[PDB]
C-alpha cells in the first residue's frame, strides 16, 4: 500500500455526496455558464447550496 | 385564518438571509419574515 500510495475517498459517489452537498473551499466543482445544467441546479429546492 | 408568529433565528431550524437580488422576492422554499 505505501509503495502504490493510493489516496482513497477522491471519487465523488454522485451529487449525493455529502462533500457536495456543502460548499468547501478545497473542493471546487462548476458547470457551464448558460446551459441546461445551470437551471438544473437553478430550479431545484434542495440544490440551492 | 390569520395569526402572527414569532420566530428566531437559529441553528439549521430558522436561517434568515436578505431577499434574492436575481428574482426580487423570496426564492423556493423560503417564506418572508419582518424585523423591526
Known amino acids: 500500500a505505501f509503495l502504490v500510495l493510493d489516496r482513497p475517498e477522491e471519487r465523488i459517489t454522485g451529487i449525493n455526496d455529502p462533500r457536495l452537498r456543502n460548499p468547501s473551499d478545497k473542493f471546487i466543482y462548476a458547470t457551464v455558464k448558460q446551459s441546461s445544467v445551470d437551471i438544473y441546479f437553478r430550479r431545484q429546492v434542495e440544490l440551492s447550496t | ?36
Open chain 2, 1 to 36: 385564518d390569520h395569526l402572527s408568529i414569532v420566530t428566531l433565528e437559529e441553528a439549521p431550524f430558522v436561517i434568515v438571509e436578505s431577499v434574492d437580488p436575481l428574482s426580487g422576492t423570496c426564492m423556493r422554499n423560503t417564506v418572508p419574515c419582518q424585523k423591526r
